[PDB]
Design a protein around this ligand. Structure first.
Ligand SMILES: Nc1nc2c(ncn2[C@@H]2O[C@H](COP(=O)(O)OP(=O)(O)OP(=O)(O)O)[C@@H](O)[C@H]2O)c(=O)[nH]1
Ligand SMILES: [Mg+2]
Lengths: 232, 96, 54, 92, 293, 74, 88, 159
RNA sequence: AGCCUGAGAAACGGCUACUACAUCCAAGGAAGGGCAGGCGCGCAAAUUACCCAAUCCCGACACGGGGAGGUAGUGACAAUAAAUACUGAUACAGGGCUCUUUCGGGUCUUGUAAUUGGAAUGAGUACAAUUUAAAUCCCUUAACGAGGAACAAUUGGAGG
């Protein structure tokens, strides 16, 4: 039940939606790194007008998020969730811009079929099996045995299996998803360890601005290989 | 008086009710007794025909008189909660 | 331009916005003699010197 | 009685045609939005019963009047997708 | 310094003439008149007030109606009829006044007549303007214009900033319950009456019950003869004389008291029964209307 | 069949004095005060008020007084 | 505080009576102090004209007032009168 | 003082004003503008504050039509006056454009909604008409001097 | 003072005992512990208004429920804009005004409770439609709506 100004500055609200703002329900993505489905439908896309209209869209099986039907209105969809609407025949993708806000991208089924997800941790689960945890809280059982931490994975999204992976690399272009230099698509050119907590990388854009961002806030997107269509 | 701007009083006796000339200041002056302190001071009704509204034992508000008896300092402003000039102009009736 | 996007009507201000914006006149030296605005010669004049030095 | 439709939006998931309507009565009194529902049947090839009009503020000095019009694909789609107060104002 | 100035001004506002109270320890019921022009609905307000207080639907309420409204104080409602003799008779009697104005029609000469009769005779504590027939309006801008102009004319008439209630409709033939509930919120909590000199020197009584105690042999002998009359009511002023009190029955003439019987109340008001809780249980909401139904 | 309240009770006039139709409107009073104070000005100084008329010069139409010196002696 | 001193003297007199006739019933409470206010009471009036009982309506109420010793005498009352403001 | 009374009476007569509150209102806004001009003259020439703020003040006054387009110095902005402001009022502009016979006729017309400034009718006679908007003062279309219905006394007479 | 539930409380929601008030009764018994409002002198001055319709929240759950929120009413404490009239013709009177210097000087068109004529109209009345949860206001708007004895300007001061 937070106010419209206490809502974060990256899912935008104008002077229109009242003094209050919806809170995202608990789910895969975080609270402050989130776009709820009602803000995506009626405050960003404007396929709806009111809360009851958004409910009348959501309750019938017309909005699918990451390939599954998401019914509740304030479902969290933070980063790179393909959002398939079949009556309009569109699939939107959530990326950022250079200023630090949410951006929507229209696309069809060929790029809508896969999800590029960053690995959070690799472990040995119960049954003596290695399993893999992404930032979408997707756990994949029996992964490829080189996919370590901070590697990204092309998730199939019709079975959910691994298809390809991109390694953490000095020389692979990356996207920033946090910090004071948030949302700046550039190339990882250096990486400093700082063992004892909070190591960094040094990263430059396409046009020569060096800056240091933390290896938590980084997010690998591809060496050149823009596997998701960043908007031209 | 006191520390206030207007004082209240009881009209003890209209002194000079038997004076001859109509707008004499002895005809217009009225001895009242202030409530807060208890002293008997004299006050001017503003007009001789306006004297008739001032009856005995009536709560009377009085103020200063800032400008035939030089030195009577007070003038009657309200009588029984109604303004005396309004009573004289026949705007209001006096609640008794 | 916000009433053709999803075309829900607005309440023409309210008691809590009019309390704010009409108090903004109370603490400002602006005045509107005609079509134009006439700004006070306080801190708005010092920035003109403060920009030109840099 | 002169009509123009700006910003016509399809909205298939809510199944309703969204029009910003600028109507003009010069010299007449106001437009009687039930008769405007009757007028927005042959302009967009629909029944009168599946049209709902709201907004409808008259511009300063007569003439122009801005309304917002919604045409549903069926009266039952209107019935299941309309607010109660707009349904009462329409008469269903 | 200005706090001292305002304190001195309020300390001079609090003062009055030191008049005598003459109110007993077990006080009589305070008298509420319902005054207004003909056709304004004084009897309708009487029915609605007695249903609010004592829950008794009176089909034809006449005479004074005594009503327990608190554990210490009680009221009595008398509706003044449309005759000037009754209005001048009750203006020297009334403790609080319910002064009715007829809404869309505006002020009336009977209302102004009773206002200045009351002011000349003796001003009581509480007079409440009650403005009715508001439902006989078509434009609710004309409604608030009429409320504003009637409020300002009444404020010029009696005093600035009075209480003017607005009773809108007539639903069940009675009044709206919320409107008469806030009206009774104002006339239920009460303060001691103003020390009027005439009521504090002369003993009066307002007759609740009338009966003709005359021998039918005397009525059969002379059909128009001097009768003896039992009049039962509350002694309200100072105390009557024990023997040989001279009485003016207003509208009839002067007589003498042949007998006084002093007897217990029909409305006991639980302080007199117990002789610190707030609410009144429904054991206590008594109704004493010995001429009404 | 009701007793209407009349205008004297409707607005409590009382004994206010009788004032003027000019005094009931503050603009018309300030119009007539300016017309009479512009009129008092012509009786002291001399206004221009147009030169020679269309008819020409019909003489100094209100007297010529010879022994009158009306110059500010510096 | 002359106002509160005067009001306190009035309340002292109003305690001195009801302290002074609170000593006996048949003598003081009945014959000295009369029939005290607030108590319901029944009055018997002898000698009322029969037109009152024939034309008695319950609407127009009955007010019983007590005349003083001075209010039964007749004579020339000299009054201070003024016509009303709204009397034509 | 008699000087103030005669000055305010000359203003109220020469421009058909209602009271002296309008005169004091104009004198207050004129004193505000002139105080800003004096404060800008306090600084030396070629200070950037004085340069841009004085250019803003002079362009504002020339655009609202009080100051003449010939003289554009801050000394003439100091030499401004209330006769120039009351000349820029709407009521005297109707009288000078000749839609009305006298200034009180002009106030009467503007009150009962005959003239319009540009597009919308103007109900207030103290409307500060700018220089660009001075030309578009004319009778409205709903006025009988403009057109439409012949009007009120005309209708009662022609019936 | 002690205890109970639940993912989350030492809830104060409940229980028990003691302490302290207090209610009903057929005198054996039995249930219960807040805010808001008025008076606070005998003399006074802002609604006991309407709704979840928007934004938001809780639930078996599209429907059920919300004392946030929004809508309305009062208000000369201030503050803002400005009505209560505009314009002619004719007739008649010869004075009107001013001052330093006053039984004196200065200036030249001014009136009238005169007779008539034109128009303009917003306060108010008001069919509607619209606004809105339903209303109101606003914006549109057909029809009426000015001759003083009225659609009725006030507060002070000085003088004959
Ligand atoms: N619409 C409306 N009608 C009312 C209102 N008040 C009273 N009435 C009606 O007016 C009628 C007058 O009845 P009463 O109120 O008894 O008249 P009264 O003056 O009180 O009684 P009398 O003095 O005997 O005429 C009743 O039939 C009421 O229904 C009101 O506020 N609105
Ligand atoms: Mg009755």
């Amino acid at each position: 039940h937070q106010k419209r100004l206490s809502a974060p500055s990256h899912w935008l609200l104008d002077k229109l939606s009242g003094a209050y703002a919806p809170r995202p329900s608990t789910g895969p993505h975080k609270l402050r790194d989130c776009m709820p489905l009602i803000v995506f439908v009626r405050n960003r896309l404007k396929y709806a007008l009111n809360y009851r209209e958004t409910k009348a869209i959501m309750m019938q099986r017309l909005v699918k998020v990451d390939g599954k039907v998401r019914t509740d209105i304030t479902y969290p969809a933070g980063f790179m969730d393909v959002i398939t609407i079949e009556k309009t025949g569109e699939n939107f993708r959530l990326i950022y811009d250079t200023k630090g806000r949410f951006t929507v991208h229209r696309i069809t089924d060929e790029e809508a079929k896969y999800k590029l997800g960053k690995v959070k941790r690799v472990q040995l689960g119960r049954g003596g099996v290695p399993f893999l945890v992404t930032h979408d809280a997707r756990t994949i059982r029996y992964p490829d045995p080189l996919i370590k931490v901070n590697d990204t994975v092309k998730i199939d999204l019709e079975t959910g299996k691994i298809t390809d992976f991109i390694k953490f690399d000095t020389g692979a272009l990356a996207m920033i998803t946090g910090g004071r230099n948030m949302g700046r698509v550039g190339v990882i050119t250096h990486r400093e360890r700082h063992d004892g907590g909070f190591g960094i990388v040094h990263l430059k854009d396409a046009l020569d601005n060096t800056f240091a961002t933390r290896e938590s806030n980084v997010f690998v997107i591809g060496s050149e290989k823009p596997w998701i269509s960043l908007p031209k | 008086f006191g520390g206030s701007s207007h004082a209240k009083g009881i009209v003890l006796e209209k002194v000079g009710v038997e004076a001859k000339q109509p707008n004499s200041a002895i005809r217009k002056c009225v001895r009242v007794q202030l409530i807060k302190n208890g002293k008997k001071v004299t006050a001017f009704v503003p007009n001789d025909g306006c004297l008739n509204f001032v009856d005995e034992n009536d709560e009377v508000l009085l103020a200063g008189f800032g400008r035939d008896i030089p030195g009577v300092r007070f003038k009657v402003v309200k009588v029984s909660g109604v303004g005396l000039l309004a009573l004289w102009k026949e705007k209001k009736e006096k609640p008794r | 331009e916000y009433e053709e996007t999803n075309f829900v009507r607005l309440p023409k201000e309210s008691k809590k916005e009019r309390a704010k914006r009409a108090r903004m006149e109370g603490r400002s030296g602006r005045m509107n003699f005609g079509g134009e605005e006439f700004r006070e010669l306080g801190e708005g004049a010092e920035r003109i010197s403060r920009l030109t030095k840099a | 009685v002169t009509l123009r439709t700006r910003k016509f939006i399809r909205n298939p998931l809510l199944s309703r045609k969204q029009m910003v309507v600028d109507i003009l009565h010069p010299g007449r009194p106001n437009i009687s939005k039930d008769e405007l529902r009757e007028k927005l049947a042959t302009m967009y090839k629909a029944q009168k019963d599946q049209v709902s009009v709201f907004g409808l503020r008259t511009q300063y000095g007569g003439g122009k009047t801005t309304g917002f019009a919604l045409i549903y694909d069926s009266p039952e789609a209107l019935k299941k997708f309309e607010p109660r107060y707009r349904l009462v104002r329409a008469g269903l | 310094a200005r706090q001292a100035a305002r304190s001195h001004d309020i300390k001079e506002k609090r003062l009055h003439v030191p008049l005598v109270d003459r109110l007993p320890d077990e006080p009589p019921p305070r008298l509420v008149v319902i005054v207004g022009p003909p056709g304004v609905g004084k009897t309708t307000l009487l029915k609605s007030l007695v249903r609010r207080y004592t829950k008794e639907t009176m089909s034809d309420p006449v005479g004074p109606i005594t009503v327990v409204t608190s554990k210490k104080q009680r009221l009595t409602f008398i509706e003044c009829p449309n005759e000037l003799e009754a209005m001048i008779d009750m203006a020297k009697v009334a403790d609080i006044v319910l002064l009715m104005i007829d809404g869309n029609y505006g002020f009336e000469m009977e209302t102004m007549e009773f206002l200045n009769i009351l002011a000349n005779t003796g001003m009581p504590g509480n007079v409440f303007g009650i403005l009715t027939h508001l439902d006989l309006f078509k434009k609710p801008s004309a409604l608030k214009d009429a409320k504003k102009r009637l409020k300002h004319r009444l404020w010029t008439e009696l005093y600035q900033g009075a209480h003017l209630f607005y009773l809108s409709g007539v639903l069940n033939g009675r009044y709206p319950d919320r409107e008469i509930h806030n009206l009774s919120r104002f006339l239920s909590v009460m303060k001691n009456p103003r020390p009027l000199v005439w009521r504090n020197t002369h003993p009066y009584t307002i007759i609740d019950n009338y009966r003709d105690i005359t021998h039918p042999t005397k009525i059969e002998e002379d059909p128009l003869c001097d009768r003896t009359i039992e009049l039962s009511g509350y002694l309200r002023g100072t105390n009557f004389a024990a023997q040989g009190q001279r009485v003016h029955i207003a509208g009839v003439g002067d007589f003498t008291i042949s007998k006084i019987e002093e007897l217990p109340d029909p409305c006991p008001t639980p302080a007199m029964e117990k002789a610190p809780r707030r609410r009144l249980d429904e054991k206590d909401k008594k109704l004493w209307a010995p001429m009404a139904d | 069949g009701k007793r209407q309240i009349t205008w004297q009770i409707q607005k409590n006039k009382g004994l206010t004095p009788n004032r003027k139709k000019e005094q009931r409107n503050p603009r018309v009073k300030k119009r007539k005060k300016y017309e009479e104070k512009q009129k008092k000005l012509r009786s002291v100084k001399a206004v221009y008020k147009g030169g020679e008329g269309p008819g020409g010069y019909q003489g100094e139409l209100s007297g010529i007084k010879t022994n009158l010196v009306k110059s500010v002696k510096l | 505080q002359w106002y509160e001193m005067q009001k306190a003297m009035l309340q002292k007199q109003l305690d001195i009576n009801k302290a002074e006739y609170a000593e006996l019933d048949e003598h003081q409470r009945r014959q000295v102090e009369g029939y005290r206010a607030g108590k319901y009471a029944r009055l018997v009036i002898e000698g009322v004209p029969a037109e009152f009982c024939k034309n008695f309506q319950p609407r127009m109420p009955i007010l019983v007032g007590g005349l003083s010793a001075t209010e039964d005498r007749f004579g020339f009352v000299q009054v201070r009168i003024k016509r009303h403001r709204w009397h034509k | 003082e008699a000087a103030r009374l005669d000055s305010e009476l000359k203003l109220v007569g020469e421009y058909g004003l209602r009271n002296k509150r309008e005169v004091w209102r104009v004198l207050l806004t004129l004193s505000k503008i002139r105080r800003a001009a004096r404060i800008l003259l306090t600084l030396d020439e070629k200070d950037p504050k004085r340069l841009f703020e004085g250019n803003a003040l002079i362009r504002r006054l020339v655009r609202i039509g009080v100051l003449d387009e010939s003289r554009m110095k801050l000394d003439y902005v100091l030499a401004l006056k209330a006769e120039d402001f009351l000349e820029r009022r709407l009521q005297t502009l109707v009288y000078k454009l000749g839609l009305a016979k006298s200034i009180h006729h002009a106030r009467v017309l503007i009150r009962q909604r005959h003239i319009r400034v540009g597009k919308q009718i103007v109900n207030v006679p103290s409307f500060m008409v700018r220089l660009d908007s001075q030309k578009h003062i004319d009778f409205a279309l709903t006025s009988p001097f403009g057109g439409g219905r012949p009007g009120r006394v005309r209708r009662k007479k022609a019936k």
